[PDB]
Amino acid sequence: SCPGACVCYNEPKVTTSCPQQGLQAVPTGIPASSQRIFLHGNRISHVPAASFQSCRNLTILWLHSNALARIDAAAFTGLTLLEQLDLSDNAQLHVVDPTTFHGLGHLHTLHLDRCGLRELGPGLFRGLAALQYLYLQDNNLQALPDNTFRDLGNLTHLFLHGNRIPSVPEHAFRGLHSLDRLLLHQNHVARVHPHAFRDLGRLMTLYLFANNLSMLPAEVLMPLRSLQYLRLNDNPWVCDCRARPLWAWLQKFRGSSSEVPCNLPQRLADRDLKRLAASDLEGC
Amino acid sequence: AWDEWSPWSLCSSTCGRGFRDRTRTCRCEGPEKQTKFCNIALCP
Numbered sequence: 001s002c003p004g005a006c007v008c009y010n011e012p013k014v015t016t017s018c019p020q021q022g023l024q025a026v027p028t029g030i031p032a033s034s035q036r037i038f039l040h041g042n043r044i045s046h047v048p049a050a051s052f053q054s055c056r057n058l059t060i061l062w063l064h065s066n067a068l069a070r071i072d073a074a075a076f077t078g079l080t081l082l083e084q085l086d087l088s089d090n091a092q093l094h095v096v097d098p099t100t101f102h103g104l105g106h107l108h109t110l111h112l113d114r115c116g117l118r119e120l121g122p123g124l125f126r127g128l129a130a131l132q133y134l135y136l137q138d139n140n141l142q143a144l145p146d147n148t149f150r151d152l153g154n155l156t157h158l159f160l161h162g163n164r165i166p167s168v169p170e171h172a173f174r175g176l177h178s179l180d181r182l183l184l185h186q187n188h189v190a191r192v193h194p195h196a197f198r199d200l201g202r203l204m205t206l207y208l209f210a211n212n213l214s215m216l217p218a219e220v221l222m223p224l225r226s227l228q229y230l231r232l233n234d235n236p237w238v239c240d241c242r243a244r245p246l247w248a249w250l251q252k253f254r255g256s257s258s259e260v261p262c263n264l265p266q267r268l269a270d271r272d273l274k275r276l277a278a279s280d281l282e283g284c
Numbered sequence: 285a286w287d288e289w290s291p292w293s294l295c296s297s298t299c300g301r302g303f304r305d306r307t308r309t310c311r312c313e314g315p316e317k318q319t320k321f322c323n324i325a326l327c328p
């Protein structure tokens with residue numbers, strides 16, 4: 001009944017577990033009653049269409065740390081109750097067909113970090129209304145297109161750090177009304193649209209450190225009425241009068257922020273924007 | 285005659301187990317500093 005490379009047990013949930021067994025393919029004969037399937041740490045290179053189709057009650061599927069080079073668009077057909085899908089640490093994946101997650105209406109945790117992803121294609125996260133945690137860090141993303149997350153009204157954690165994102169457009173984060181933590185550090189972000197955070201009134205943690213920011217428009221942080229933790233260090237901040245709105249916002253912020261180190265002008269290059277006097281930012 | 289607690293700090297680490305702290309100044313029974321657990325992310 002159980003595949004030779006696996007251990008199968010019924011409690012607490014029906015589980016087929018075969019991690020780190022040197023598998024090059026999804027094993028045949030996984031029990032249709034499986035509720036959890038653990039295939040992490042193998043060398044699986046392809047997930048064909050309907051690889052788990054008979055497992056109608058599946059809620060946990062772990063495929064991380066494999067050698068995935070292709071996931072069929074219909075790989076997850078049948079998995080209408082799937083709640084957790086870990087595809088992370090498959091550095092040669094590179095692309096996920098934008099229909100791959102369609103129909104996963106109970107999905108609440110989706111791991112896609114360390115997958116070599118070059119882009120988030122149109123519709124990739126369509127209709128994932130139950131999604132809570134979305135891990136996209138440590139890929140090769142070079143853009144955050146408008147409306148990429150627009151249906152993710154229940155998302156609370158969005159990790160995007162460790163990519164090559166050069167800017168945040170107006171509607172990148174449209175729809176993210178429940179978002180709690182937004183991790184955007186270690187990117188190439190050179191500007192944030194003034195209204196990029198309009199829907200993030202419930203955000204509590206924002207990381208923007210290790211980017212390419214020299215300034216933030218006056219409006220950017222205004223919508224962040226619940227913010228408690230803010231990291232802005234390791235950016236080339238200019239501390240002249242163009243920094244006055246950020247300075248003023250930081251003076252009134254009731255949470256905790258990182259140092260905001262001045263890069264220029266040289267006479268202030270040894271200072272934290274937060275600690276400057278108002279007279280240092282006069283002029284415009 | 286305690287003053288209000290400061291906001292909790294940034295997390296000591298953003299990978300794995302870390303802590304935040306907060307402080308308050310007198311004017312008086314109770315602590316002066318507290319810490320609490322934080323975990324932002326798992327890092328390989």
Ligand SMILES: *[C@@H]1O[C@@H](C)[C@@H](O)[C@@H](O[C@@H]2O[C@H](CO)[C@@H](O)[C@H](O)[C@H]2O)[C@@H]1O
Nearest residue numbers: 161183185186297298299324325326327
């Ligand atoms: C805070 O956010 C995390 C999600 C990571 O991106 C952290 O970076 C990692 O920090 C550890 C030390 O805690 C370093 O050893 C890793 O090299 C670094 O990627 C970040 O500080």
Ligand SMILES: *[C@@H]1O[C@H](CO)[C@@H](O)[C@H](O)[C@H]1NC(C)=O
Nearest residue numbers: 031032033034054055056057
């Ligand atoms: C799914 O669970 C239901 C309810 O326990 C059960 O009747 C059904 O046989 C299960 N489906 C599979 C494919 O095992």
Ligand SMILES: *[C@@H]1O[C@H](CO)[C@@H](O)[C@H](O)[C@H]1NC(C)=O
Nearest residue numbers: 105106128129130131153154
């Ligand atoms: C969205 O989140 C709320 C609160 O957790 C929940 O009641 C609702 O069912 C969720 N929507 C889904 C799962 O589609």
Ligand SMILES: *[C@H]1O[C@H](CO)[C@@H](O)[C@H](O)[C@@H]1O
Nearest residue numbers: 286287288289290306308
């Ligand atoms: C700090 O702690 C609590 C609020 O967290 C209260 O006892 C009071 O605000 C104190 O200053």
Ligand SMILES: *[C@H]1O[C@H](CO)[C@@H](O)[C@H](O)[C@@H]1O
Nearest residue numbers: 228255290291292293306
């Ligand atoms: C720290 O703890 C929570 C947020 O993590 C709040 O009670 C408040 O922000 C406090 O300073």
Ligand SMILES: Nc1ccc(C(=O)O)cc1
Nearest residue numbers: 009011012013015017038
């Ligand atoms: N890694 C895991 C292995 C097994 C189980 C379980 O049987 O609950 C959970 C996690």
Ligand SMILES: [Cl-]
Nearest residue numbers: 229293294295
């Ligand atoms: Cl933090």
